[PDB]
Amino acid sequence: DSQSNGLLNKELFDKVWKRLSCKEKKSGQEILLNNLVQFYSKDTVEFVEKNIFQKIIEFGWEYYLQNGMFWNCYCRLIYFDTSRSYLDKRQYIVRKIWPQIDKKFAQSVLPSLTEFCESYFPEEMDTLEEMFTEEP
Amino acid sequence: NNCSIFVGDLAPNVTESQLFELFINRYASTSHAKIVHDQVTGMSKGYGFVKFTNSDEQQLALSEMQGVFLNGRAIKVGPTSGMSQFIYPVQQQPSLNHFTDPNNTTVFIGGLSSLVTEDELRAYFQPFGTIVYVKIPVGKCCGFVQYVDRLSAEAAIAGMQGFPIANSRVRLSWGRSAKQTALLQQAMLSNSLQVQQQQPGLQQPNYGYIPSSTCEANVSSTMLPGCQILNYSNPQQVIMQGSEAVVNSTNAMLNRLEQGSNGFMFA
Amino acid sequence: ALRGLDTQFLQDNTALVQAYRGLDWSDISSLTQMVDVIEQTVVKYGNPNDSIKLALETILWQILRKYPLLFGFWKRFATIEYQLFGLKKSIAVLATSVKWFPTSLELWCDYLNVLCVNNPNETDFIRNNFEIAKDLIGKQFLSHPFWDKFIEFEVGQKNWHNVQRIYEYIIEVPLHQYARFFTSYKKFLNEKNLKTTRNIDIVLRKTQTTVNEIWQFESKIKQPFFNLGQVLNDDLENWSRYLYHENTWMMYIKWLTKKNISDEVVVDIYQKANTFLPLDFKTLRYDFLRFLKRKYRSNNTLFNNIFNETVSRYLKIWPNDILLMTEYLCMLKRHSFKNSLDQSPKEILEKQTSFTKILETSITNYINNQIDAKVHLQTLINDKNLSIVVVELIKTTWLVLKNNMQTRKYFNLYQKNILIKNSVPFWLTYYKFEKSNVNFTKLNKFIRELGVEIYLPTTVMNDILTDYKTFYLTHSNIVTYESSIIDSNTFDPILYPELKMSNPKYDPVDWHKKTEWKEAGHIGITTERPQISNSIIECNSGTLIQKPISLPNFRNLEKINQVKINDLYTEEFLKE
């Protein structure tokens, strides 16, 4: 679709990943996370979600799992796809993202995820509420 | 008037207190008196200046002290001030309205459609400079935008003029605050004086502040002149300018775009 | 607005009705209308309503006076005098008075019986119970009042022990323990009573209101909460509100939420705070909306109607708000048309298409000025909050139904409208849609029109230009860039978003008569400064020596003292 490669170059992605590995010393962490999700394709969104986001899930670093803006950018990456339908990506985001995040780490994620859920997922509000309720 | 008299050839044992006692409280009221001493020795050179408020009392003191006994010698209290081509220019005053005040930094905005809010009107006038309040009168289709800097008000008027807000052209001018407008309305209902008051200054010099500079958000500051040292907070207090300011502003504008794409704020 | 002038007019009407010495039915109707206007415009405290209730009770209007007692109790919770007047009244009544005298008293038992000045209400209830031959009800009323910390606790206990000669010491140990607990509670509250009673004095200052003593009593009641802090905190909040304070109401709401109270009394307190406090607050309304959004998971039947009533009450008083329309649209998309992921996708797609068709029909009916009273969405859409409905329609159309030509047709249809051509989220949603596509021609058409015809706020324009400088440098090349450069308006998408940051208007490409030469040295005040037409300040003397220079041509030499000021502040705001 005449889409040229942006930040995901071999001389560019390594420089981004060398900065994102500090997690407390280098500011401008969420700026890249909001600016690495501006491609909106079928294979490029999969490429971005495979290189960094699946790797953050695999390592399980504390800073990105604690911040809810990371998961907000990750949900914004999938939800604005131009090839998928609505039901498949909605089932994807509800079923295979929200049970993956930690329940005790949701104290800083819920003020950032509640705005996204009130934004785009109106009927999925009470489902997310019953998952993060006060009693087991 | 502040008439000045120059006493000369005084004795060595005559301080400023004796000259102030001999000048003031003798059929006059001397406002100030200072004997010009040495720069590094501390001893008086025998000369002194006495500045009074009225010229007639200073003239009477100079006529009465011409030859008086001052610490064993003469006083010589003749006047110092009061056909060349070169004279200093003298001017009158514009009687201190809200147009001719250089410290007047609040802009009167009008021509609104009675539809814009206060946060949106803050968002119109936010990047021009730091701001203190954005309150508007109700039912009057106008408002008040007070900055801290005067160059920020110049930039706001030079940019925002002719800008239609909500399909209604704007009218930008000067104006007073709300309390001064209430005082002018209370003095204009009886029409006695209707006098205004000048806006207070900044107690200049101010080395740390840089005009037309905004900041929304430990601090190890080097206080270097190329960067910014101090700034006014956005409501309000005084903040030390950190290094992570453009990062916080970028995160804030990305959050503003994300919350404005959905409709959580209109500003 | 002037409550003193209304009180003086009501007193003058009462003095005229007293000096007329007759019926004066027209004057009585005018006084009743003035009292109703004063009750609707002001708080209508019991001290000013006591004379109105005495005038209504003397005019044989007890059916109207019994209805006013509930309004006087709801207006002032700490009005023990109005409760005593209501308990003294309704005695010469019909056969339901035995069901009415206690029910009007026991309802005061949970509202004003927790105060230190409630010694007369219990004595009035005991005197009302003394008329009947029920000794057990009087013994229960004496046992209930002896367990509470009142002023005359020991005298009331001695009266209950000396009056009931047949039931004096039936249960001595429990009554003695209750009296000891009441004496301990009175000795604990005596410090706050001495701090409040020795400072309450009308001197037109902060001592008459006693905000410090009320805050100390509220802090002491929040600290010693030994299973009775609810009624004591309610009495303290009523005494602090009787002596509009949003901070004390917020502290009382936080103390009620922290004590794990029921949602019904909390919703009633929220409704009483929304009714009794004046408007233009915008501090407790968003907290009540957030509490409703949090408690929608517990109940869905009453909470949706409560949120609809709150939106109807908030949109009638704040018409220029935009977050309330978003909250109403989110509640309508969550509660009315709900579809989980476990259901069939055909029903979910039909529900999304029905919601999109309902939003499109509501927008088309609001554009065509056609209202429907059966639908609340026809009423709740305002001209300020219509663009956010258009944004929700575009979002539901493009991000769910997945159609591009239909979305561009909505974009071409709803861009020429008068009301929504200068709105933030519509053009920002169009910008995000054109960012999602790979094209850049519509992006340059947007940012070139961003200061010419699309009038947006300056912060929003700076955010759009900075985001375009972020996005365009990471998703474009020189081959696309060099073809986009035109010389008619010197448009270059790398440098043009930088120069357009300061000023909203910016042209890309007779000087002495413009509006910039006149107000150069000083802004706001215009003046026509004198200049020289044939100025030789630019030509060097190596060229001026070639020929003799002509005479200087003069202009504006008749305005060296004349200056004019476009005084808008006096003419448009002072002199109207």
Coordinates of N, CA, C and O in Angstrom, one line a residue, chain A:
Chain A
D1 N 0.8 -1.2 0.0 CA 0.0 0.0 0.0 C 0.9 1.3 0.0 O 0.5 2.3 0.6
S2 N 2.0 1.2 -0.6 CA 3.0 2.3 -0.8 C 3.4 2.8 0.6 O 3.6 4.1 0.7
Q3 N 3.6 2.0 1.5 CA 4.0 2.4 2.9 C 5.5 2.1 3.1 O 5.9 1.0 3.1
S4 N 6.2 3.2 3.3 CA 7.6 3.1 3.5 C 7.9 2.9 5.0 O 7.1 3.3 5.9
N5 N 9.0 2.2 5.3 CA 9.4 1.8 6.7 C 9.8 3.1 7.4 O 10.7 3.8 7.0
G6 N 9.3 3.3 8.6 CA 9.6 4.4 9.4 C 10.7 4.2 10.4 O 11.8 4.1 10.1
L7 N 10.3 4.1 11.7 CA 11.2 3.9 12.8 C 11.7 2.5 12.9 O 12.7 2.2 13.6
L8 N 11.1 1.5 12.2 CA 11.5 0.1 12.2 C 12.6 -0.3 11.2 O 12.5 -1.3 10.5
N9 N 13.6 0.5 11.2 CA 14.8 0.3 10.3 C 15.9 -0.3 11.2 O 15.9 -0.2 12.4
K10 N 16.8 -1.0 10.5 CA 17.9 -1.7 11.2 C 18.9 -0.7 11.8 O 19.5 -1.0 12.8
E11 N 19.0 0.5 11.3 CA 19.8 1.6 11.9 C 19.0 2.5 12.8 O 19.5 3.4 13.4
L12 N 17.7 2.2 13.0 CA 16.8 3.1 13.8 C 16.1 2.3 14.9 O 16.0 2.9 16.0
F13 N 15.7 1.1 14.7 CA 15.0 0.3 15.8 C 16.0 0.0 16.9 O 15.5 -0.1 18.1
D14 N 17.2 -0.3 16.6 CA 18.2 -0.6 17.7 C 18.5 0.7 18.5 O 18.6 0.5 19.8
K15 N 18.5 1.9 17.9 CA 18.6 3.1 18.7 C 17.4 3.4 19.6 O 17.6 4.0 20.7
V16 N 16.2 3.0 19.2 CA 15.0 3.1 20.0 C 15.1 2.1 21.2 O 14.8 2.4 22.3
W17 N 15.4 0.8 20.8 CA 15.4 -0.2 21.9 C 16.6 0.0 22.9 O 16.5 -0.5 24.0
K18 N 17.6 0.7 22.5 CA 18.7 1.0 23.4 C 18.3 2.0 24.4 O 18.8 2.1 25.5
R19 N 17.3 2.9 24.0 CA 16.8 3.9 25.0 C 15.7 3.4 25.8 O 15.5 3.7 27.0
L20 N 14.8 2.5 25.2 CA 13.7 2.0 26.0 C 14.1 0.9 27.0 O 13.2 0.6 27.9
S21 N 15.3 0.5 27.1 CA 15.7 -0.5 28.0 C 16.1 0.1 29.4 O 16.4 -0.7 30.3
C22 N 16.2 1.4 29.5 CA 16.6 2.0 30.8 C 15.5 2.1 31.8 O 15.7 1.8 33.0
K23 N 14.3 2.5 31.4 CA 13.0 2.4 32.1 C 12.8 3.4 33.3 O 11.7 3.6 33.8
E24 N 13.9 4.0 33.7 CA 13.8 5.1 34.7 C 14.8 6.2 34.5 O 14.6 7.3 35.1
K25 N 15.8 6.1 33.7 CA 16.9 7.1 33.5 C 16.6 8.0 32.3 O 17.1 9.2 32.4
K26 N 16.0 7.5 31.3 CA 15.8 8.3 30.1 C 14.3 8.7 29.9 O 13.4 7.8 29.9
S27 N 14.0 10.0 29.9 CA 12.6 10.4 29.7 C 12.2 10.3 28.3 O 13.0 10.1 27.4
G28 N 10.9 10.5 28.0 CA 10.4 10.4 26.7 C 10.1 8.9 26.3 O 10.3 8.5 25.2
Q29 N 9.7 8.1 27.3 CA 9.4 6.7 27.0 C 8.0 6.5 26.4 O 7.9 5.8 25.4
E30 N 7.0 7.2 26.8 CA 5.7 7.1 26.2 C 5.5 7.8 24.9 O 4.6 7.6 24.2
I31 N 6.5 8.8 24.6 CA 6.4 9.5 23.4 C 6.7 8.6 22.2 O 6.1 8.6 21.2
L32 N 7.7 7.7 22.4 CA 8.0 6.7 21.4 C 6.9 5.6 21.3 O 6.6 5.2 20.2
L33 N 6.3 5.3 22.4 CA 5.2 4.3 22.4 C 4.0 4.8 21.7 O 3.2 4.1 21.2
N34 N 3.8 6.2 21.8 CA 2.7 6.8 21.0 C 3.1 7.1 19.6 O 2.2 7.3 18.7
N35 N 4.4 7.1 19.3 CA 4.9 7.3 17.9 C 5.4 6.1 17.2 O 5.9 6.3 16.1
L36 N 5.4 5.0 17.8 CA 5.7 3.7 17.1 C 4.4 3.0 16.7 O 4.5 1.9 16.2
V37 N 3.2 3.6 17.0 CA 2.0 3.0 16.7 C 1.2 3.8 15.6 O 0.0 3.8 15.5
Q38 N 2.0 4.4 14.7 CA 1.4 5.3 13.7 C 1.6 4.8 12.3 O 2.0 5.5 11.4
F39 N 1.4 3.5 12.1 CA 1.6 2.9 10.8 C 0.3 2.4 10.2 O 0.0 2.7 9.0
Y40 N -0.5 1.7 11.0 CA -1.9 1.3 10.7 C -2.0 0.4 9.4 O -2.6 0.8 8.4
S41 N -1.4 -0.8 9.5 CA -1.4 -1.8 8.4 C -1.8 -3.1 9.0 O -2.1 -3.3 10.2
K42 N -1.8 -4.1 8.2 CA -2.0 -5.5 8.6 C -0.7 -6.2 9.1 O -0.7 -6.8 10.1
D43 N 0.3 -6.1 8.3 CA 1.6 -6.8 8.6 C 2.5 -5.9 9.4 O 3.3 -6.4 10.2
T44 N 2.4 -4.6 9.3 CA 3.3 -3.7 10.0 C 2.9 -3.5 11.5 O 3.8 -3.5 12.4
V45 N 1.6 -3.5 11.7 CA 1.1 -3.6 13.1 C 1.5 -4.9 13.8 O 1.9 -4.9 15.0
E46 N 1.4 -6.0 13.1 CA 1.9 -7.3 13.6 C 3.4 -7.2 13.8 O 3.9 -7.8 14.8
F47 N 4.1 -6.5 13.0 CA 5.6 -6.4 13.1 C 5.9 -5.6 14.4 O 6.8 -6.0 15.2
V48 N 5.2 -4.5 14.6 CA 5.5 -3.7 15.8 C 5.0 -4.4 17.1 O 5.8 -4.4 18.1
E49 N 3.9 -5.1 17.0 CA 3.4 -5.9 18.2 C 4.3 -7.1 18.4 O 4.3 -7.6 19.6
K50 N 5.1 -7.6 17.4 CA 5.9 -8.7 17.6 C 7.3 -8.3 18.2 O 7.9 -9.0 19.0
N51 N 7.8 -7.1 17.7 CA 9.2 -6.8 18.1 C 9.3 -6.3 19.5 O 10.2 -6.7 20.3
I52 N 8.5 -5.3 19.9 CA 8.6 -4.7 21.2 C 7.6 -5.2 22.2 O 7.9 -5.7 23.3
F53 N 6.3 -5.2 21.8 CA 5.2 -5.4 22.8 C 5.1 -6.9 23.3 O 5.0 -7.1 24.5
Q54 N 5.3 -7.8 22.4 CA 5.4 -9.2 22.7 C 6.7 -9.5 23.5 O 6.7 -10.4 24.4
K55 N 7.7 -8.7 23.2 CA 8.9 -8.9 24.0 C 8.8 -8.3 25.4 O 9.4 -8.8 26.3
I56 N 8.0 -7.2 25.6 CA 7.8 -6.7 26.9 C 6.9 -7.7 27.7 O 7.1 -7.9 28.9
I57 N 6.0 -8.4 27.0 CA 5.2 -9.4 27.7 C 6.1 -10.6 28.0 O 5.9 -11.2 29.1
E58 N 7.0 -10.9 27.2 CA 7.9 -12.1 27.4 C 8.9 -11.8 28.6 O 9.0 -12.7 29.4
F59 N 9.5 -10.7 28.6 CA 10.4 -10.3 29.7 C 9.7 -10.0 31.0 O 10.0 -10.4 32.1
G60 N 8.6 -9.2 30.8 CA 7.8 -8.8 32.0 C 8.5 -7.7 32.8 O 8.7 -7.9 34.0
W61 N 8.9 -6.6 32.2 CA 9.6 -5.5 32.9 C 8.6 -4.8 33.7 O 7.4 -4.7 33.4
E62 N 9.0 -4.3 34.9 CA 8.1 -3.7 35.9 C 7.6 -2.4 35.4 O 6.4 -2.1 35.7
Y63 N 8.4 -1.5 34.8 CA 8.0 -0.2 34.5 C 6.9 -0.1 33.4 O 5.9 0.7 33.6
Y64 N 7.0 -0.9 32.4 CA 5.9 -0.9 31.4 C 4.7 -1.6 31.8 O 3.6 -1.3 31.4
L65 N 4.8 -2.6 32.6 CA 3.7 -3.3 33.2 C 2.9 -2.5 34.2 O 1.7 -2.7 34.4
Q66 N 3.7 -1.6 34.9 CA 3.0 -0.7 35.9 C 2.3 0.4 35.2 O 1.2 0.7 35.6
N67 N 2.8 1.0 34.2 CA 2.2 2.1 33.5 C 1.1 1.6 32.6 O 1.2 0.7 31.8
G68 N -0.1 2.3 32.7 CA -1.2 1.9 31.9 C -1.2 2.6 30.5 O -2.0 2.2 29.6
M69 N -0.4 3.6 30.3 CA -0.3 4.3 29.0 C 0.3 3.4 28.0 O 0.0 3.5 26.8
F70 N 1.2 2.5 28.4 CA 1.8 1.5 27.6 C 0.7 0.5 27.0 O 0.7 0.3 25.8
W71 N -0.2 0.0 27.9 CA -1.3 -0.8 27.4 C -2.3 0.0 26.6 O -3.0 -0.6 25.7
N72 N -2.4 1.3 26.9 CA -3.3 2.1 26.1 C -2.8 2.3 24.7 O -3.6 2.2 23.7
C73 N -1.5 2.5 24.5 CA -0.9 2.6 23.2 C -0.9 1.2 22.5 O -1.1 1.2 21.3
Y74 N -0.8 0.1 23.3 CA -0.9 -1.2 22.6 C -2.3 -1.5 22.2 O -2.4 -2.1 21.1
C75 N -3.3 -1.1 22.9 CA -4.7 -1.3 22.4 C -5.0 -0.4 21.3 O -5.8 -0.8 20.4
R76 N -4.4 0.8 21.3 CA -4.6 1.7 20.2 C -4.0 1.3 18.9 O -4.4 1.6 17.8
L77 N -2.9 0.5 19.0 CA -2.2 -0.1 17.9 C -3.1 -1.1 17.2 O -3.2 -1.1 15.9
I78 N -3.7 -2.0 17.9 CA -4.6 -3.0 17.3 C -5.9 -2.5 16.9 O -6.4 -2.8 15.8
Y79 N -6.5 -1.6 17.7 CA -7.9 -1.2 17.4 C -8.0 -0.3 16.2 O -9.1 -0.3 15.5
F80 N -7.0 0.4 15.8 CA -7.0 1.2 14.6 C -6.4 0.5 13.4 O -5.9 1.2 12.5
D81 N -6.6 -0.8 13.3 CA -6.1 -1.5 12.1 C -7.1 -1.3 11.0 O -8.3 -1.0 11.2
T82 N -6.6 -1.3 9.7 CA -7.4 -1.0 8.6 C -7.8 -2.3 7.8 O -8.5 -2.2 6.8
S83 N -7.4 -3.4 8.2 CA -7.7 -4.7 7.6 C -8.7 -5.6 8.3 O -9.4 -6.3 7.7
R84 N -8.6 -5.5 9.6 CA -9.5 -6.4 10.4 C -10.9 -5.8 10.5 O -11.1 -4.6 10.2
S85 N -11.9 -6.6 10.9 CA -13.2 -6.2 11.2 C -13.3 -5.6 12.6 O -12.3 -5.3 13.2
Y86 N -14.5 -5.3 13.1 CA -14.6 -4.8 14.5 C -14.7 -6.0 15.5 O -14.1 -5.9 16.6
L87 N -15.5 -7.0 15.2 CA -15.7 -8.1 16.1 C -14.5 -8.9 16.5 O -14.3 -9.2 17.6
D88 N -13.6 -9.2 15.5 CA -12.4 -10.0 15.7 C -11.4 -9.2 16.5 O -10.9 -9.8 17.5
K89 N -11.2 -7.9 16.2 CA -10.2 -7.2 17.1 C -10.8 -6.9 18.4 O -10.0 -6.8 19.4
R90 N -12.1 -6.7 18.5 CA -12.7 -6.5 19.9 C -12.6 -7.8 20.7 O -12.3 -7.6 21.9
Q91 N -12.8 -8.9 20.1 CA -12.7 -10.2 20.9 C -11.2 -10.4 21.2 O -10.9 -10.9 22.3
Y92 N -10.3 -10.0 20.3 CA -8.8 -10.0 20.6 C -8.4 -9.2 21.8 O -7.8 -9.7 22.7
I93 N -8.9 -7.9 21.8 CA -8.5 -7.0 22.9 C -9.1 -7.4 24.2 O -8.5 -7.4 25.3
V94 N -10.4 -7.9 24.2 CA -11.0 -8.2 25.4 C -10.5 -9.6 26.0 O -10.2 -9.7 27.2
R95 N -10.4 -10.6 25.1 CA -10.0 -11.9 25.6 C -8.6 -12.1 25.9 O -8.2 -12.8 26.8
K96 N -7.7 -11.6 25.0 CA -6.3 -12.0 25.1 C -5.3 -10.8 25.4 O -4.1 -10.9 25.1
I97 N -5.9 -9.8 26.0 CA -5.0 -8.7 26.6 C -5.4 -8.4 28.0 O -4.5 -8.4 28.9
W98 N -6.6 -8.2 28.3 CA -7.1 -7.8 29.7 C -6.9 -8.9 30.7 O -6.6 -8.5 31.9
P99 N -7.1 -10.2 30.5 CA -6.7 -11.2 31.5 C -5.2 -11.3 31.6 O -4.7 -11.9 32.6
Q100 N -4.4 -10.8 30.6 CA -2.9 -11.0 30.7 C -2.3 -10.0 31.7 O -1.3 -10.4 32.3
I101 N -2.9 -8.8 31.9 CA -2.3 -7.9 32.8 C -2.5 -8.2 34.2 O -3.5 -9.0 34.5
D102 N -1.7 -7.7 35.1 CA -1.7 -8.1 36.5 C -2.9 -7.4 37.2 O -3.2 -6.2 36.9
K103 N -3.4 -8.0 38.3 CA -4.5 -7.4 39.0 C -4.0 -6.5 40.1 O -4.7 -5.4 40.3
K104 N -2.9 -6.8 40.7 CA -2.4 -5.9 41.7 C -1.6 -4.7 41.1 O -1.4 -3.7 41.8
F105 N -1.2 -4.8 39.8 CA -0.6 -3.7 39.1 C -1.7 -2.8 38.4 O -1.3 -1.8 37.8
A106 N -3.0 -3.1 38.6 CA -4.0 -2.3 37.9 C -4.3 -1.0 38.6 O -5.2 -0.3 38.1
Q107 N -3.7 -0.7 39.7 CA -4.0 0.6 40.4 C -3.5 1.8 39.6 O -4.1 2.9 39.7
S108 N -2.5 1.6 38.8 CA -2.0 2.7 37.9 C -2.4 2.5 36.5 O -2.3 3.4 35.7
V109 N -3.0 1.3 36.1 CA -3.4 1.0 34.8 C -4.9 1.4 34.6 O -5.2 1.9 33.6
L110 N -5.7 1.2 35.6 CA -7.1 1.5 35.6 C -7.5 3.0 35.3 O -8.4 3.3 34.6
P111 N -6.7 4.0 35.9 CA -7.0 5.4 35.4 C -6.6 5.6 34.0 O -7.1 6.6 33.4
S112 N -5.7 4.8 33.4 CA -5.4 5.0 32.0 C -6.2 4.1 31.1 O -6.3 4.4 29.9
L113 N -6.7 3.0 31.6 CA -7.4 2.0 30.7 C -8.9 2.3 30.8 O -9.7 2.0 29.9
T114 N -9.4 3.0 31.9 CA -10.8 3.4 32.0 C -11.2 4.4 31.0 O -12.3 4.4 30.4
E115 N -10.3 5.3 30.7 CA -10.5 6.4 29.7 C -10.6 5.7 28.3 O -11.4 6.1 27.5
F116 N -9.8 4.7 28.0 CA -9.8 4.0 26.7 C -11.1 3.2 26.6 O -11.7 3.1 25.5
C117 N -11.5 2.6 27.7 CA -12.7 1.8 27.7 C -14.0 2.6 27.6 O -14.9 2.2 26.9
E118 N -14.0 3.8 28.2 CA -15.1 4.7 28.1 C -15.1 5.3 26.7 O -16.1 5.7 26.2
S119 N -13.9 5.4 26.1 CA -13.8 6.0 24.7 C -14.4 5.1 23.6 O -15.3 5.5 22.9
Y120 N -13.9 3.9 23.5 CA -14.2 3.0 22.4 C -15.0 1.8 22.6 O -15.5 1.2 21.7
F121 N -15.0 1.3 23.9 CA -15.6 0.0 24.2 C -16.7 0.2 25.3 O -16.5 -0.1 26.4
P122 N -17.9 0.7 24.8 CA -18.9 1.1 25.8 C -19.6 -0.1 26.5 O -19.8 -0.1 27.7
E123 N -19.9 -1.2 25.7 CA -20.5 -2.3 26.3 C -19.5 -3.2 27.1 O -20.0 -4.1 27.8
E124 N -18.2 -3.0 26.9 CA -17.2 -3.8 27.6 C -16.8 -3.1 28.9 O -15.7 -3.4 29.4
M125 N -17.6 -2.2 29.4 CA -17.2 -1.5 30.6 C -17.5 -2.3 31.9 O -16.7 -2.5 32.8
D126 N -18.7 -2.9 31.9 CA -19.1 -3.7 33.1 C -18.3 -5.1 33.1 O -18.2 -5.7 34.2
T127 N -17.9 -5.5 32.0 CA -17.1 -6.7 31.9 C -15.7 -6.5 32.5 O -15.2 -7.3 33.3
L128 N -15.1 -5.3 32.2 CA -13.8 -5.0 32.8 C -14.0 -4.6 34.2 O -13.0 -4.7 35.0
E129 N -15.2 -4.1 34.6 CA -15.4 -3.8 36.0 C -15.5 -5.0 36.9 O -15.0 -5.0 38.0
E130 N -16.1 -6.1 36.4 CA -16.2 -7.3 37.2 C -14.9 -8.1 37.2 O -14.8 -9.0 38.1
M131 N -14.0 -7.8 36.4 CA -12.6 -8.4 36.4 C -11.7 -7.7 37.4 O -10.8 -8.3 38.0
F132 N -11.9 -6.4 37.7 CA -11.1 -5.6 38.6 C -11.9 -5.1 39.8 O -11.6 -4.0 40.3
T133 N -12.8 -5.9 40.2 CA -13.6 -5.5 41.4 C -12.9 -5.8 42.7 O -11.8 -6.3 42.7
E134 N -13.5 -5.3 43.8 CA -12.8 -5.3 45.1 C -12.7 -6.7 45.7 O -11.9 -6.9 46.6
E135 N -13.6 -7.7 45.3 CA -13.6 -9.0 45.9 C -13.2 -10.1 44.9 O -13.5 -9.9 43.7
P136 N -12.5 -11.1 45.3 CA -12.2 -12.2 44.4 C -13.4 -13.0 44.0 O -13.4 -13.7 43.0

